[PDB]
Amino acid sequence: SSKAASLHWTGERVVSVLLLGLLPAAYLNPCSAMDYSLAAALTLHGHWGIGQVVTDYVRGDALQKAAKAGLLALSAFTFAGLCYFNYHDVGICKAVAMLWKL
Amino acid sequence: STQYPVVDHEFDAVVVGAGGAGLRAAFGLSEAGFNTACVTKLFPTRSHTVAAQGGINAALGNMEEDNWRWHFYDTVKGSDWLGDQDAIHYMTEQAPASVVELENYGMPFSRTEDGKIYQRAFGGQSLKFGKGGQAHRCCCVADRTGHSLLHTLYGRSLRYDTSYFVEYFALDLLMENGECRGVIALCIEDGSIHRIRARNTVVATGGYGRTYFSCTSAHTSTGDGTAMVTRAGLPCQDLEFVQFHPTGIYGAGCLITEGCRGEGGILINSQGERFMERYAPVAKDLASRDVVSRSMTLEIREGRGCGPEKDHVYLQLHHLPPEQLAVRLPGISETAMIFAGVDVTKEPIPVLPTVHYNMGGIPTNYKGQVLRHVNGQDQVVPGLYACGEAACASVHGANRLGANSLLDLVVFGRACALSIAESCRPGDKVPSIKPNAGEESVMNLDKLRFANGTIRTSELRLSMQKSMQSHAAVFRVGSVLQEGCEKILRLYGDLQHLKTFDRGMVWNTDLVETLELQNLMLCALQTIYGAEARKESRGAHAREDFKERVDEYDYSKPIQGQQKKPFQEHWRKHTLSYVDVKTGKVSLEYRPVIDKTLNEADCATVPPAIRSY
Amino acid sequence: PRIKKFAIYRWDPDKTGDKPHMQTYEIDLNNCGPMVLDALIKIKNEIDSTLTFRRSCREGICGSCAMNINGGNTLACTRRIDTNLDKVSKIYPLPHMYVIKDLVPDLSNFYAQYKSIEPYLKKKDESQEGKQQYLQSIEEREKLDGLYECILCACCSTSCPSYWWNGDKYLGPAVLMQAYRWMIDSRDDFTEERLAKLQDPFSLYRCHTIMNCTGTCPKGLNPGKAIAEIKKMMATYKE
Amino acid sequence: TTAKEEMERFWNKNLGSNRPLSPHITIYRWSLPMAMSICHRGTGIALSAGVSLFGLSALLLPGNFESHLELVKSLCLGPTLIYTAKFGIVFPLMYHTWNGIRHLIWDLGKGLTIPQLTQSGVVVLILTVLSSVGLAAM
């Protein structure tokens, strides 16, 4: 008696308003703590985003199995790539700031 | 014939029709436990019944306190005493029970202050047997009542295992030695032919409005079941009685409801006077359909026109409240804007009396059984039933009362189901049909498929429609009816010279409309010949030469010192019409109207009286 | 005399190797009706009696003559002909549908989807039905306005780009609005499980509010609005 | 017959027959609401591709971020030429942000009439051009 499809839709709209809130929050309070939460919301929303595109156009049992895996691999590498950048490099907030006044 | 694959189907019951009556009868049998098939040439929702706007009559007593016996009186008074009172009794008593049934199925009726089903006034309905003034018993779903009826009847029919033969044109009745065996039908999708056989057959194919040039009915109202009956040599009843709805848009021929007049609509002539009070003082513009249209059609002959070329009259909604024309009648608010280009809240609607209802049809019991006529007496056709507009239990008789058909549908659809449920059980002996049976229908199909004459289907249809429009209008004289008769008979011979272009199996709309033409013609002949033979002014059938209403007594004076007229000397009787298929000859018989009720103590017989409001 | 040009989609299944093509018919507008169906029947009656199409009420209250005229899914009997003679009216069948013949689509899947939502009144105790009329307050009746009027022309669903790509697993605008129609009905007891029947990613959640449904509706109805209202019920309902 | 059986027999009939699919993308008339949903997909995909390229290069390509900035500085930093790159990044991002709010307004249940749709569609389209020029000037 589970409702997984409704909760997933709800989860999408929650991270949407979270990502909407984080963009001006990053401009106002740029820090390491805002970098990871921006790395979390940015990858998640996008991963669920393409997830919809995949379920829409990709037709097949063998193809959707591979597409959802390949997307997950990309999303995992994207989150790891950002976290590495937040830890060992300047971080998202500082990188945009440097790139802008160029 | 070695060109056509025949696939035989075996069922307990076959209902031909997916309208109101068609559907109610269909799933009612499945609910009773019967293996039921439903043969329809349209998708069930496209059935006319969808176009219904007015309402459905029931003496639920939601506005004032009402009695179904008062509704009984209004129907028989409206039927000009050609209505069979055994059938009117059954319907009026079942009226409240059958509506409650629909609302419980999920029909979204408009609501009251109390929360019950909204009823409203309608043409020819009166409390306390005509004495108590205006009556409010017409149950409606805003202005889209027939639409909602059909949808919730269809919706409910998905709950049962009824085999729907969607878009299957039923050609002829499978008949063997009087007893009915089922139907032979063309599948429109792949052009194949199917012999669907059953124990009992229910014909519910609606009216034949397309016999005329101007009708409110749909393009698919072609009296197909009517034709199937006459091709079996069985009689049709009261076919000359065609109802001319007083209010229908002059342009495309569409319909605005009688509910326009029910809420507070007024009819305006040349001067601007309420001309309906000049004809009928008591009921006014909310009188019976035969009386209101009689006024309007004669008003044009006075020279009192209203249109650009002076042909149509008026129904005015200039004064009606704006908020009332949003919750009560929103359906006509949009449909008048499209075809006529008329805003309903400020501009009046242009209307003309046009063909609306066929109260005639297949002769029927109060139990829904089809009746053949042998030795001047009635006789039931075994395994053959009919309900709705295509039928004629003569609940409407000579003139249909306003908003009674949608009732007639639900009640007699149910009645056909109940009569089968009692006479036999599901899984009984389904009688076998000859291996070479229905072959003439297949051969007929093949002849029209490869037809190559001189007159096209459309041109001959137009020639039939215009002939009926000028010869069998609201008013008609024996002189003009005689010319119309031989004119229609001439066009029946013209069927040999038919031209068909589409030669395909899949979806041959050229062929099915030509099949429809055969059916339409056979309806037309019986309508026009019966009309010319009937020498009286009864109900909708009005004769200028025979203006008198001829009964078995002269009911104007007291019933005492009067010698009763013989059966074959008056005209208070049903017109039974036969037609020889090969020569087009129309032969007529007559059977008496039923005056007795199902219970005298519960509902007394209403004897004939003067017909005026 | 005013001559209007009509370019119509034509396909015959009974003709061997016949590929889909356009066929032009010219019509005098003086002796013809104002609506497109009036024109369609005029060429059917006179010019070519092979043009196979669905018609019934000619009133805009049945939904047979539903088709794509000038890139929009509307009823042919409701759509009036453009009096501009220089423009040629292009008439097509309902978008992304299997063509049986000419402008006649296979709506079998469409109707079947409408059967799967169970569009009929469901009470938890149906032993008392057929004798008592169910009470519904005048305000609860207002709730059904804009929803019951649906004619099932399939115009809205067949305009949805998502219903093109996923017609098999996504119910579509027309069908979903009817599911909603039976959800808010105060007489229906099965409001909860009617929502639970949509708990897969395809039945309801294939909508992305493209809004082609409400935009093309010939009856002016708003299925998309209702669909968004369903989504709201899905996140709020408990048990 | 049942609802699931009708769907199962639908596809079996049509796929095993030479019936053509009626045209759809070729014939259907465009509108602003229509076009604006294509862009939201496009921008969403382009932005996800941008984020992914930024993340994936961090793990694959050697050096720190400052090393990559000096690599861009090799070419002439044109005042209006670098504006093209600065505008081309924000333009899709801001469109998707503004249109994303409109989507959220919809999911909330509000603004789903045909007039309101074309109204709010313009508002989103205008806010984009303003915010994209406004951020590139920073």
Ligand SMILES: *Cc1cc2c(cc1C)nc1c(=O)[nH]c(=O)nc-1n2C[C@H](O)[C@H](O)[C@H](O)COP(=O)(O)OP(=O)(O)OC[C@H]1O[C@@H](n2cnc3c(N)ncnc32)[C@H](O)[C@@H]1O
């Ligand atoms: C013409 C009209 C009548 C009307 C009305 C509005 C219009 C435009 N509004 C009414 C109203 O508001 N209240 C009322 O009491 N009456 C009203 N009327 C009359 C009434 O609506 C109709 O008489 C009634 O709908 C008739 O119902 P019925 O079920 O008897 O007939 P149907 O609706 O036309 O359905 C017929 C079905 O049978 C199938 N069919 C027909 N021919 C064949 C053949 N060839 N083979 C197989 N199937 C066939 C059709 O598919 C159709 O579904």
Ligand code: HEM
């Ligand atoms: C803060 C600003 C943003 C807001 C308000 C927002 C909001 C939304 C919402 C609500 C959706 C779902 C639309 C639907 O299908 O109903 C969506 C789609 C999508 N978004 Fe975002 N988003 C934002 C930024 C981003 C970013 C930065 C990315 C890049 C990673 C992104 C990638 C996507 C993708 C891939 C889709 C799916 C495309 C589609 O199905 O239309 N979004 N956006």
Ligand SMILES: CN(C)Cc1cccc(NC(=O)c2ccccc2C(F)(F)F)c1
């Ligand atoms: C309506 N035209 C003719 C344009 C056209 C053509 C092809 C696809 C699309 N639009 C989509 O493909 C689309 C866009 C945004 C969200 C969801 C979708 C969809 F659900 F997957 F269908 C539009």
Ligand code: SF4
């Ligand atoms: S919601 Fe509108 S477009 Fe969709 S089927 Fe109903 S009337 Fe047609």
Ligand code: F3S
């Ligand atoms: S046309 Fe399809 S996109 Fe959803 S609101 Fe739209 S139903």
Ligand code: FES
């Ligand atoms: S034919 Fe009835 S809607 Fe066009």
